[PDB]
């Protein structure tokens, strides 16, 4: 069904919080990471882990938690205390069940946004609503990290974009049964939820701190490709004997932006030579069931050609509400990242800066006007 949720969107509802006991000493570490780290008992831990095997992890919720879970003990093995004292080789015990588990899942064997925010929260009261003060993480890095507030707000941001995914189906359907105002309202309709996702947007900022992201939690995010840290990759022992790499790039890796790209016939799939590679590549990052929603949105009739075809100014001003929404997002996004990487880093990315500066021009160059 593209796994793809009516109130929570792209996000994993209801998440499991509970492996069975057979997998304790995983769970043990995993929740543990701020005091094993801080101790520096973390790595000899990992590495006095037996072999326990992923037959016991019986359905999907179920895998989603152990890959959250061996994600987060992968990230804090190879980066340690975050000051480059380094772990190159994942040790046979985490890196066998960890990369099967991926396979089984067919994401990479590294933490990405689908586990540390669309799988990794909670309802503190399951009867009060999907507000950041009803809610939780299952799994933070260090004290102070701020890992709370970057995935919580994420994963809001996701919820909020449900709204406008769930009337996608609608779009489609007008278009083919010739429904000029079914379409119109629709397109209002999403407009209006990307633009009350904007706002929720700005809750980053009442819980995230630029010092804490750029200087602690950015640090158990970052992968090991183009990593002068883990130049070749990393070696997972006993699955590949070479080292591989895989970016570790969790907030690029919603699918939310490209969701509405690709439903706007806005062309980032193909197209700049380094802009399109990042955003293809991202795809990779990715669970299957969402790559492939995006994939049969780009197979779908152009609503950007059906909007054109029409000489009708109404649907051209719905058509260009979308546009706007993803541009507003976009450029409030630009404002963030030079908040939260761009000052810090001075204080010790006009690549990084380039390549959003691209996509939102490219998506401000959709507008229809006419
Ligand atoms: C909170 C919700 C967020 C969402 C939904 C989101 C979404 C995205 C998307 C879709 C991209 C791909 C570029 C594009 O499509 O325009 C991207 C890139 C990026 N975002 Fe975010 N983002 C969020 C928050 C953040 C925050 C708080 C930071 C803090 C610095 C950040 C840092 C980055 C970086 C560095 C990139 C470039 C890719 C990379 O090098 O990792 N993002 N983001
Ligand atoms: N801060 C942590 C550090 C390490 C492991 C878990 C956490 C949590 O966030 C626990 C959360 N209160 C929960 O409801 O599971």
């Given at each position: 069904?593209?796994?793809?949720?009516?109130?929570?969107?792209?996000?994993?509802?209801?998440?499991?919080?509970?492996?069975?006991?057979?997998?304790?000493?995983?769970?043990?570490?995993?929740?543990?990471?701020?005091?094993?780290?801080?101790?520096?008992?973390?790595?000899?831990?990992?590495?006095?882990?037996?072999?326990?095997?992923?037959?016991?992890?019986?359905?999907?919720?179920?895998?989603?938690?152990?890959?959250?879970?061996?994600?987060?003990?992968?990230?804090?093995?190879?980066?340690?205390?975050?000051?480059?004292?380094?772990?190159?080789?994942?040790?046979?015990?985490?890196?066998?069940?960890?990369?099967?588990?991926?396979?089984?899942?067919?994401?990479?064997?590294?933490?990405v946004?689908?586990?540390?925010?669309?799988?990794?929260?909670?309802?503190?009261?399951?009867?009060?609503?999907?507000?950041?003060?009803?809610?939780?993480?299952?799994?933070?890095?260090?004290?102070?990290?701020?890992?709370?507030?970057?995935?919580?707000?994420?994963?809001?941001?996701?919820?909020?974009?449900?709204?406008?995914?769930?009337?996608?189906?609608?779009?489609?359907?007008?278009?083919?049964?010739?429904?000029?105002?079914?379409?119109?309202?629709?397109?209002?309709?999403?407009?209006?939820?990307?633009?009350?996702?904007?706002?929720?947007?700005?809750?980053?900022?009442?819980?995230?701190?630029?010092?804490?992201?750029?200087?602690?939690?950015?640090?158990?995010?970052?992968g090991?490709?183009?990593?002068?840290?883990?130049?070749?990759?990393?070696?997972?022992?006993?699955?590949?004997?070479?080292?591989?790499?895989?970016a570790g790039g969790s907030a690029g890796q919603?699918?939310?932006?490209?969701?509405?790209?690709?439903?706007?016939?806005?062309?980032?799939?193909?197209?700049?030579?380094?802009?399109?590679?990042?955003?293809?590549?991202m795809?990779?990052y990715?669970?299957?069931?969402?790559?492939?929603?995006?994939?049969?949105?780009?197979?779908?009739?152009?609503?950007?050609?059906?909007?054109?075809?029409?000489?009708?100014?109404?649907?051209?001003?719905?058509?260009?509400?979308?546009?706007?929404?993803?541009?507003?997002?976009?450029?409030?996004?630009?404002?963030?990242?030079?908040?939260?990487?761009?000052?810090?880093?001075?204080?010790?990315?006009?690549?990084?800066?380039?390549?959003?500066?691209?996509?939102?021009?490219?998506?401000?160059?959709?507008?229809?006007?006419?």
């Amino acid at each position: 069904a593209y796994h793809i949720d009516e109130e929570v969107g792209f996000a994993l509802p209801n998440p499991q919080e509970n492996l069975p006991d057979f997998y304790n000493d995983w769970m043990f570490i995993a929740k543990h990471l701020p005091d094993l780290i801080e101790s520096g008992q973390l790595r000899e831990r990992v590495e006095k882990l037996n072999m326990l095997s992923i037959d016991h992890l019986t359905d999907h919720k179920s895998q989603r938690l152990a890959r959250l879970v061996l994600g987060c003990i992968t990230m804090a093995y190879v980066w340690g205390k975050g000051h480059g004292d380094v772990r190159k080789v994942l040790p046979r015990n985490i890196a066998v069940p960890y990369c099967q588990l991926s396979a089984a899942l067919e994401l990479p064997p590294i933490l990405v946004y689908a586990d540390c925010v669309l799988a990794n929260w909670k309802k503190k009261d399951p009867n009060k609503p999907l507000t950041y003060e009803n809610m939780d993480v299952l799994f933070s890095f260090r004290d102070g990290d701020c890992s709370k507030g970057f995935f919580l707000v994420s994963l809001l941001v996701e919820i909020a974009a449900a709204s406008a995914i769930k009337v996608i189906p609608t779009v489609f359907k007008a278009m083919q049964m010739q429904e000029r105002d079914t379409l119109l309202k629709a397109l209002l309709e999403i407009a209006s939820c990307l633009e009350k996702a904007l706002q929720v947007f700005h809750q980053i900022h009442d819980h995230v701190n630029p010092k804490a992201f750029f200087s602690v939690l950015r640090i158990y995010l970052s992968g090991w490709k183009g990593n002068p840290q883990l130049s070749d990759g990393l070696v997972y022992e006993g699955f590949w004997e070479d080292p591989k790499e895989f970016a570790g790039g969790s907030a690029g890796q919603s699918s939310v932006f490209q969701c509405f790209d690709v439903l706007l016939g806005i062309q980032q799939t193909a197209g700049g030579g380094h802009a399109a590679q990042f955003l293809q590549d991202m795809r990779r990052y990715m669970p299957p069931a969402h790559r492939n929603f995006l994939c049969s949105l780009e197979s779908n009739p152009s609503v950007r050609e059906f909007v054109l075809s029409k000489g009708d100014a109404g649907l051209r001003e719905a058509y260009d509400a979308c546009v706007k929404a993803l541009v507003s997002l976009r450029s409030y996004h630009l404002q963030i990242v030079t908040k939260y990487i761009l000052i810090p880093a001075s204080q010790q990315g006009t690549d990084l800066m380039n390549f959003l500066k691209t996509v939102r021009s490219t998506t401000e160059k959709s507008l229809l006007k006419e």
